[PDB]
Amino acid sequence: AYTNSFTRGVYYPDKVFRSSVLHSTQDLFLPFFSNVTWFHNPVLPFNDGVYFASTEKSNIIRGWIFGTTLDSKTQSLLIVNNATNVVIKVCNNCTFEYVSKNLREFVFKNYFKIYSKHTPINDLPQGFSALEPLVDLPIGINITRFQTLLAAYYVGYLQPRTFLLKYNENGTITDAVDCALDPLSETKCTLKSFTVEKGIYQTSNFRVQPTESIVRFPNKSTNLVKNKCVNFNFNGLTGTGVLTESNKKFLPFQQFGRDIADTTDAVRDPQTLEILDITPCSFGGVSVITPGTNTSNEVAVLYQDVNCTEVPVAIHADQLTPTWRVYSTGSNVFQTRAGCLIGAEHVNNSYECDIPIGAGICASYQTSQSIIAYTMSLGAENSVAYSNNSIAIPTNFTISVTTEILPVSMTKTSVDCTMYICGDSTECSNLLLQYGSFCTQLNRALTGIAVEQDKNTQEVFAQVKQIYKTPPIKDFGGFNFSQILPDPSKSKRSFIEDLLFNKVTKFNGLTVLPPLLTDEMIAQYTSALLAGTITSGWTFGAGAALQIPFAMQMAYRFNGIGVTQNVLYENQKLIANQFNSAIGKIQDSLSSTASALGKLQDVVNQNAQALNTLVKQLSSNFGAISSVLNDILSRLDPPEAEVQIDRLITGRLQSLQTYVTQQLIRAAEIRASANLAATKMSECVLGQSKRVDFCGKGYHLMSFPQSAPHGVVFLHVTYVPAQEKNFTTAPAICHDGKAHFPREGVFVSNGTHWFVTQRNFYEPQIITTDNTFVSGNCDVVIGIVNNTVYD
Amino acid sequence: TASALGKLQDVVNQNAQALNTLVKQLSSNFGAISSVLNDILSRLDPPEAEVQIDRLITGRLQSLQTYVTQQLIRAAEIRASANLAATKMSECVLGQSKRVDFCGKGYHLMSFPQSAPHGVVFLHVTYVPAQEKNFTTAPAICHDGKAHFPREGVFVSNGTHWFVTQRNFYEPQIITTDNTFVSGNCDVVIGIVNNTVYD
Amino acid sequence: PLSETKCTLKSFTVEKGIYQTSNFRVQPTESIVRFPNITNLCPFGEVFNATRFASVYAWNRKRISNCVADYSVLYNSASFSTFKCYGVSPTKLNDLCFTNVYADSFVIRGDEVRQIAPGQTGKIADYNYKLPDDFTGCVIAWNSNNLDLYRLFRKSNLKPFERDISTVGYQPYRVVVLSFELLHAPATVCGPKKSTNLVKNKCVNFNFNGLTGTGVLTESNKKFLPFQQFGRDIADTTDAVRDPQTLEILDITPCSFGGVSVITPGTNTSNEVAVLYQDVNCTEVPVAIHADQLTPTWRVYSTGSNVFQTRAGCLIGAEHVNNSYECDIPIGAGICASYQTQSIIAYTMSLGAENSVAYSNNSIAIPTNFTISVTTEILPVSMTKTSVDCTMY
Amino acid sequence: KFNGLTVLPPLLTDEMIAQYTSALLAGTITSGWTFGA
Amino acid sequence: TASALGKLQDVVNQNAQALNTLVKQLSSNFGAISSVLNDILSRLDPPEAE
Ligand SMILES: *[C@@H]1O[C@H](CO)[C@@H](O)[C@H](O)[C@H]1NC(C)=O
Ligand SMILES: *[C@@H]1O[C@H](CO)[C@@H](O)[C@H](O)[C@H]1NC(C)=O
Ligand SMILES: *[C@@H]1O[C@H](CO)[C@@H](O)[C@H](O)[C@H]1NC(C)=O
Ligand SMILES: *[C@@H]1O[C@H](CO)[C@@H](O)[C@H](O)[C@H]1NC(C)=O
Ligand SMILES: *[C@@H]1O[C@H](CO)[C@@H](O)[C@H](O)[C@H]1NC(C)=O
Ligand SMILES: *[C@@H]1O[C@H](CO)[C@@H](O)[C@H](O)[C@H]1NC(C)=O
Ligand SMILES: *[C@@H]1O[C@H](CO)[C@@H](O)[C@H](O)[C@H]1NC(C)=O
Ligand SMILES: *[C@@H]1O[C@H](CO)[C@@H](O)[C@H](O)[C@H]1NC(C)=O
Ligand SMILES: *[C@@H]1O[C@H](CO)[C@@H](O)[C@H](O)[C@H]1NC(C)=O
Ligand SMILES: *[C@@H]1O[C@H](CO)[C@@H](O)[C@H](O)[C@H]1NC(C)=O
Ligand SMILES: *[C@@H]1O[C@H](CO)[C@@H](O)[C@H](O)[C@H]1NC(C)=O
Ligand SMILES: *[C@@H]1O[C@H](CO)[C@@H](O)[C@H](O)[C@H]1NC(C)=O
Numbered sequence A: 001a002y003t004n005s006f007t008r009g010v011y012y013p014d015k016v017f018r019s020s021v022l023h024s025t026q027d028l029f030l031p032f033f034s035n036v037t038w039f040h041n042p043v044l045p046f047n048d049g050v051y052f053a054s055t056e057k058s059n060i061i062r063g064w065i066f067g068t069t070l071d072s073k074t075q076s077l078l079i080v081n082n083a084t085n086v087v088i089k090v091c092n093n094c095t096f097e098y099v100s101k102n103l104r105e106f107v108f109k110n111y112f113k114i115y116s117k118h119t120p121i122n123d124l125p126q127g128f129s130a131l132e133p134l135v136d137l138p139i140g141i142n143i144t145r146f147q148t149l150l151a152a153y154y155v156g157y158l159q160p161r162t163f164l165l166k167y168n169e170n171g172t173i174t175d176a177v178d179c180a181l182d183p184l185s186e187t188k189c190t191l192k193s194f195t196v197e198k199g200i201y202q203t204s205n206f207r208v209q210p211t212e213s214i215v216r217f218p219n220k221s222t223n224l225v226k227n228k229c230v231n232f233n234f235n236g237l238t239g240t241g242v243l244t245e246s247n248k249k250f251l252p253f254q255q256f257g258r259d260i261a262d263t264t265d266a267v268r269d270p271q272t273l274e275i276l277d278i279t280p281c282s283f284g285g286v287s288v289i290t291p292g293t294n295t296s297n298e299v300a301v302l303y304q305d306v307n308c309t310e311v312p313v314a315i316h317a318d319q320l321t322p323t324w325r326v327y328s329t330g331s332n333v334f335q336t337r338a339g340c341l342i343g344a345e346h347v348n349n350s351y352e353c354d355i356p357i358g359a360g361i362c363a364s365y366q367t368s369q370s371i372i373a374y375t376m377s378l379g380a381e382n383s384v385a386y387s388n389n390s391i392a393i394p395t396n397f398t399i400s401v402t403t404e405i406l407p408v409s410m411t412k413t414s415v416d417c418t419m420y421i422c423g424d425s426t427e428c429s430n431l432l433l434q435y436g437s438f439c440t441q442l443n444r445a446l447t448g449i450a451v452e453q454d455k456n457t458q459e460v461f462a463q464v465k466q467i468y469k470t471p472p473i474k475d476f477g478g479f480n481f482s483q484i485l486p487d488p489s490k491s492k493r494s495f496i497e498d499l500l501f502n503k504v505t506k507f508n509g510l511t512v513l514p515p516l517l518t519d520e521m522i523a524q525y526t527s528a529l530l531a532g533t534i535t536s537g538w539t540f541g542a543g544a545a546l547q548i549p550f551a552m553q554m555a556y557r558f559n560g561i562g563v564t565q566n567v568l569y570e571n572q573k574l575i576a577n578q579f580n581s582a583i584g585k586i587q588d589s590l591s592s593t594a595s596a597l598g599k600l601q602d603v604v605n606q607n608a609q610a611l612n613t614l615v616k617q618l619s620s621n622f623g624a625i626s627s628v629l630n631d632i633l634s635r636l637d638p639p640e641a642e643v644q645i646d647r648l649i650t651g652r653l654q655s656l657q658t659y660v661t662q663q664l665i666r667a668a669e670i671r672a673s674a675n676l677a678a679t680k681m682s683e684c685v686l687g688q689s690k691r692v693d694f695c696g697k698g699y700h701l702m703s704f705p706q707s708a709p710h711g712v713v714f715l716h717v718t719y720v721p722a723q724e725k726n727f728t729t730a731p732a733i734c735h736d737g738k739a740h741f742p743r744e745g746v747f748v749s750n751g752t753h754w755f756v757t758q759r760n761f762y763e764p765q766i767i768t769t770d771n772t773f774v775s776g777n778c779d780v781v782i783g784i785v786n787n788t789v790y791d
Numbered sequence B: 001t002a003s004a005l006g007k008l009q010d011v012v013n014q015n016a017q018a019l020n021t022l023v024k025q026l027s028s029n030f031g032a033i034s035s036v037l038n039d040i041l042s043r044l045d046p047p048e049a050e051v052q053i054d055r056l057i058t059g060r061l062q063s064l065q066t067y068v069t070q071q072l073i074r075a076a077e078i079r080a081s082a083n084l085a086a087t088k089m090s091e092c093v094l095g096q097s098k099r100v101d102f103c104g105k106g107y108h109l110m111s112f113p114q115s116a117p118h119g120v121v122f123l124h125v126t127y128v129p130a131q132e133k134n135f136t137t138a139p140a141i142c143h144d145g146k147a148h149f150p151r152e153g154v155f156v157s158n159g160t161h162w163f164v165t166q167r168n169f170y171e172p173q174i175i176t177t178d179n180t181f182v183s184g185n186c187d188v189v190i191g192i193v194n195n196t197v198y199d
Numbered sequence C: 001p002l003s004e005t006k007c008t009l010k011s012f013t014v015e016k017g018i019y020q021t022s023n024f025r026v027q028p029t030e031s032i033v034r035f036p037n038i039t040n041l042c043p044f045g046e047v048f049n050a051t052r053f054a055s056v057y058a059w060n061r062k063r064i065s066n067c068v069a070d071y072s073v074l075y076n077s078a079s080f081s082t083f084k085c086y087g088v089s090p091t092k093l094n095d096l097c098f099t100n101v102y103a104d105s106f107v108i109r110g111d112e113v114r115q116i117a118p119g120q121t122g123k124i125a126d127y128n129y130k131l132p133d134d135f136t137g138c139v140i141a142w143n144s145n146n147l148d149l150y151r152l153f154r155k156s157n158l159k160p161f162e163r164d165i166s167t168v169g170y171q172p173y174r175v176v177v178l179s180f181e182l183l184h185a186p187a188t189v190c191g192p193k194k195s196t197n198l199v200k201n202k203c204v205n206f207n208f209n210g211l212t213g214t215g216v217l218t219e220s221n222k223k224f225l226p227f228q229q230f231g232r233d234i235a236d237t238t239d240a241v242r243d244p245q246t247l248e249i250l251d252i253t254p255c256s257f258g259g260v261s262v263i264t265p266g267t268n269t270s271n272e273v274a275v276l277y278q279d280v281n282c283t284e285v286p287v288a289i290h291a292d293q294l295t296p297t298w299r300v301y302s303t304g305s306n307v308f309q310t311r312a313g314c315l316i317g318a319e320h321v322n323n324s325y326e327c328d329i330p331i332g333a334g335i336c337a338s339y340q341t342q343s344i345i346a347y348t349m350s351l352g353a354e355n356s357v358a359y360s361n362n363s364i365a366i367p368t369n370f371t372i373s374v375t376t377e378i379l380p381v382s383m384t385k386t387s388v389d390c391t392m393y
Numbered sequence D: 001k002f003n004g005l006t007v008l009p010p011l012l013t014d015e016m017i018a019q020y021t022s023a024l025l026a027g028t029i030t031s032g033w034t035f036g037a
Numbered sequence E: 001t002a003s004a005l006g007k008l009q010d011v012v013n014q015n016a017q018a019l020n021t022l023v024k025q026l027s028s029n030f031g032a033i034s035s036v037l038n039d040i041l042s043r044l045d046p047p048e049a050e
């Protein structure tokens, strides 16, 4: 009888307290969802370590016996528990002695370590319970078999498997992940987290192992094997690859062929005058494609650059868990240009890309729900009804507000060079003094980056000479502006600014310098810019601020984009309502989703990852006897302590140099982004921009700035036509033998009558010498149309 | 003012300091018994001179790599600055720019180039209003039940009379059909006022 | 501080600004050694003075724990021909504390004496007795010709620390190897080091079972399990330690440190400076700046009436001013410093003159005049074409 | 690919890039800047 | 003509040259007595092979 072990049998790997930390350890652990034999007397082998489970209340089981032969000729160990006493012996010829409804778990491993746990239960239960160490017997005995002294118990065997342990605030293990259970758990272990976001993650490395070794010597030699990755040995040079027939013709005195980069590609075998190619056997990456962890646990596996029929072989599929073997076969394979994709159903339909794979292939979690792989769709097919006498003219419009987010600055991290490399060590400092001024160079570069961050922030935000305030009367012609104007009733930031700020959320020589401008000052600058823009248009940026009603400012903007002011003057209420609705939609989207500020989240995550890597680089030996400078100094003499300290110094100096170089490149990127943001605030906010798609999609009317953690957000108010109608158009109108052309507009016809209308809004007008101008005769213009012109 | 050209002097100082650090890096032992190849070779046999020379080679190669990486980053920054300068020469100098604050504060009239050590200097001539006056304004004018809007400018009032003026300079004009156009009626415009339009 | 700034800048003239000159550090005040109170003398007599030693192919092994070893007698004894230690220095045995000791004793020939070392091969060093490449211990060899079997061969080379039993320079030399266990475990075999008292809330140099360090020891409320001896943080660094003599958990906080910046105007203007101690309270500034070991001029910038606590650190030597002006020398968190009536003043930077535009729905401001302004813009274009001959360099 | 070197294919194929450019050309020819606005 | 599209060809050449240099760097001894890992392992002892 076999029973599923669920996820039980996890003990404490070491005696080190940990709290609120995810720690990955490598030791002998019971595999998750394994099979344990159920005995309902028998002698069983020990292997590496034994997990014992008992479900009893009457305490039938009393002890254990361990050994090899269990009858003389060796030492056998024995444990017996009676009443409130426990006796352990290695018996005579005794060399050791020790005296010290219910589910009891025990773990025995070889020094003999015994971990124990006791729980109440009401059929192995489903749950988690860590095992605290209880017994450590200094025996040094070889055990390969054991038996139980007494009616039902479970026996399982431990294996060398890596686990990711989760510690709570009180130091008790709550959850764990078996890194070799399935691709999802491997992804969790690689990400060092229990939650995985949607996407593709490169987790593993796949390589074909050699199957046999062949040696060929000229007249101890073996027979050559073709079409198999083998460990060959021709003459004097060794290698691993696949030997196949080749059409190359070597010269009689030549034995090997080299590629352009000094790489051997063909070899002539010594026994026979034959040339064999050498191709490396398959290798590549193994990536896991998953949706959100809380969405589904289904995953797909992609093996880059491998034939899809050789995936099961050379991946040790037979040596992996049965859970992983699902992702090697199953008639659900798909050979793409990137590689063989297993676990995703191929769909002939095309949708928008969700998770890219390569060569136009995308995967998604769509309909039962399963992973589907398809070819990405470039968009909706369209065909413009083009003709030489038809024009489409809009009759309505929509006011749309879009959002753009740009990073501006970073966190000013300052790394104490000497404290990081040789912290609290005079000998280490003296040894480091021989390396010149690398340390001063690193400090200077970091200081330059820190100053550049403040320069970026000042350039982006400090663009207004004075501080402007909105009047107490907010009669702005129907426009609300209350969502973006500052709220003094509470850090006097606006509602949207608060949403943005809430959306995004010191030792070994590492420090963080505060920015020169505080969030309150940045909010003050943004409020001044908003007040100036609302009250004076672009006059505040051109010079002294000149007040103007907001309706007249919007009329200015429409005239600038090419629409007459009357459109605003008798569509004012509709335009104001559309603007208010757009602002409300922006607020709702910001309050709902959290991926809008991913541009700033990426910068924060990159900086945090770099800092964490720098911190973790201090635990490496770099070839030394230990990674602790104090331990090296207290253990070794100066003649050898110097060598160990030199190794550590070289490693840590290399780590610091790498960190500084990466920080410099990232700072260059952030400075470019800050320059772009400064230009956008100068052009979109302080004026009206005619550049296409610079200040959002559509005809840009205006823009509003907001401050976000280490960045600026632009709300781009634009004009977009909505409904269009067909009309018949003519390049010119012939009235009295002279061609007529419109001053500003197009000629259109509803079927019987001809009018002149503006480009971006349908407004027919009587053709008149005030609307048109005369130029030339009617015999030159192609497509002229006879009509009359009013006078 | 001596510190007017600090942008170019910063580049000069950075390059000079990098070169000075690279030169001073030759005085470091890097773990060897001495920083002089000639002294090492004259004092020691090839078996140990090899170790000393290897230490010196490693140190000096690391110094060169650091210097070259810093120089590459600085060169990329200078290339970005040169591209910006070329764009400014094309737009501000060879034409009139409508971009705000691209060619100086104010309404950019024109610009002049001058040379400087490893740099270019732009003298931006711009227009800036100086003195401003208050006026009463209306969105449109009612004359005969029809709304009149200015062709180019705004309506202003000195207290009793209504004129039409351009945006950036006060120049009152008689409100006529030459500078006003008719569109719509008087019942829809918000804030319309009553006046006369001369024919 | 001004002369220190000059020394760091390698110049006799210092431009106006704030410069990073030196570093802040609190020196330890007390030395703490805490060892278990074990009076059991470690029994090395049964290992060293034993009359009968087993053969080389059946080398005798003994395990030592729960004792206070004294290697000074063995080191000072002249009865040992050679005493070679590899992972630990001979003189640091008296100070270091181990967990377990393995004593392996046998008898070999003088030629094979040199073969008892890591990374060695031979008749005995490869087919009879092996040592790990990272062996940590000491080998003691001495002749016994005046005081008082080799294996031929086998199938292959036995793995280190494995014993298999199946089926002039010629004088006998007794060889005893003491291998120390350095695994992650509570220390058990210590040396004869006298323990001291325990002091808290002080920057001290502690020593818990050989775990050297420096920091401030404070009582913590961590829920340590009975088998847990110490704790680690997110960065895998020691955070709490259990007292070897008392079931008490002590939190370790490293002694205070930070940066020291000097804010000065031009030397042509004034010789007065201000000092900023980054990320530290103003209470610990004088006690750790070594003022009573520094020059009398350095004592001025350690205390005084002009002490300002800012978000960027503690500012000493600058007078706080309620008014706000344009920034002159930045400090952090909106704080700026300047040289004005003169002395160094610290204030909050001003963002500009306040203004309110007289907005209304029927009023417009129109210019009547204008001005023509010419402004200067400077952009770098190129650098110096420097080529360095790497081979000749 | 001999010593751990791999070349990942681009997500967008040459045919897809050509389709983008053809759509842009068709929109420009038959509509002007209205398709972009 | 032939030099019209040199901008893209320069990028291709730079990438190819960088890859070629990276692969070619595997033939250098870097101070060791041999550049072949298998030869070093089969010819030296672990104390020096390390
Ligand atoms: C492992 O256990 C499961 C569940 O009890 C069972 O279905 C399966 O047959 C077992 N495996 C073997 C090899 O018996
Ligand atoms: C324990 O003894 C068995 C029986 O010969 C043997 O096969 C095994 O290798 C031994 N294990 C150890 C660690 O000595
Ligand atoms: C942790 O300890 C605290 C004691 O303050 C207790 O309230 C809490 O329930 C404990 N949590 C767990 C998971 O044991
Ligand atoms: C080597 O010996 C084999 C024996 O069968 C023979 O076939 C082959 O031709 C020989 N090659 C040379 C080069 O002598
Ligand atoms: C996402 O997954 C985490 C992990 O359990 C869960 O706590 C969270 O509620 C999930 N999100 C949603 C919206 O359900
Ligand atoms: C992969 O293996 C199949 C085996 O049927 C073979 O036909 C094919 O040529 C191989 N290569 C590719 C790229 O499919
Ligand atoms: C999917 O499309 C391919 C064309 O490449 C076709 O051969 C196949 O029959 C289609 N499958 C289905 C289920 O329609
Ligand atoms: C334009 O659309 C709005 C709604 O978006 C609608 O209320 C209005 O009536 C439309 N105008 C015309 C002329 O159709
Ligand atoms: C603006 O919108 C708010 C709701 O967001 C509303 O309470 C208010 O009355 C509106 N008008 C003004 C002038 O604030
Ligand atoms: C204009 O006419 C074409 C063809 O008659 C038609 O496809 C198109 O939809 C029409 N436009 C509108 C706005 O209806
Ligand atoms: C448009 O083209 C058609 C031919 O397709 C031609 O008959 C007609 O005259 C043309 N009209 C104009 C206005 O060019
Ligand atoms: C316009 O009138 C307001 C109302 O007090 C005043 O504040 C402002 O200074 C006036 N404008 C000018 C240019 O004087």
Ligand SMILES: *[C@@H]1O[C@H](CO)[C@@H](O)[C@H](O)[C@H]1NC(C)=O
Pocket (backbone or CB within 6 Å): A475, B138, B139, B190, B191, B192, C361, C362
């Ligand atoms: C301006 O607002 C006032 C309300 O205080 C109103 O009476 C007046 O008609 C408005 N004038 C214009 C031109 O909007």
Ligand SMILES: *[C@@H]1O[C@H](CO)[C@@H](O)[C@H](O)[C@H]1NC(C)=O
Pocket (backbone or CB within 6 Å): C045, C048, C049, C073, C074, C077, C079
């Ligand atoms: C006995 O052991 C002691 C160490 O305490 C040593 O000094 C002495 O030489 C030993 N006796 C002999 C005969 O070696």
Ligand SMILES: *[C@@H]1O[C@H](CO)[C@@H](O)[C@H](O)[C@H]1NC(C)=O
Pocket (backbone or CB within 6 Å): C036, C037, C244, C245, C246
């Ligand atoms: C000796 O150490 C024990 C802990 O092992 C402690 O309880 C006891 O108080 C100590 N006694 C003295 C005198 O130090």
Ligand SMILES: *[C@@H]1O[C@H](CO)[C@@H](O)[C@H](O)[C@H]1NC(C)=O
Pocket (backbone or CB within 6 Å): C268
């Ligand atoms: C200091 O400044 C004054 C002008 O205020 C100048 O005359 C003098 O030469 C300067 N000192 C030096 C050493 O240059």
Ligand SMILES: *[C@@H]1O[C@H](CO)[C@@H](O)[C@H](O)[C@H]1NC(C)=O
Pocket (backbone or CB within 6 Å): C279, C280, C281
């Ligand atoms: C000063 O000490 C207090 C507690 O006494 C604590 O906030 C922190 O350690 C220090 N504060 C600052 C701002 O450095």
Ligand SMILES: *[C@@H]1O[C@H](CO)[C@@H](O)[C@H](O)[C@H]1NC(C)=O
Pocket (backbone or CB within 6 Å): C322
């Ligand atoms: C002036 O400074 C003192 C000293 O901190 C402070 O208590 C007081 O509130 C300040 N006065 C004003 C008006 O800020």
Ligand SMILES: *[C@@H]1O[C@H](CO)[C@@H](O)[C@H](O)[C@H]1NC(C)=O
Pocket (backbone or CB within 6 Å): C368, C369, C370, C371
């Ligand atoms: C305009 O300003 C200039 C000086 O810049 C002055 O000479 C001129 O009289 C002013 N004109 C008016 C109308 O105020």
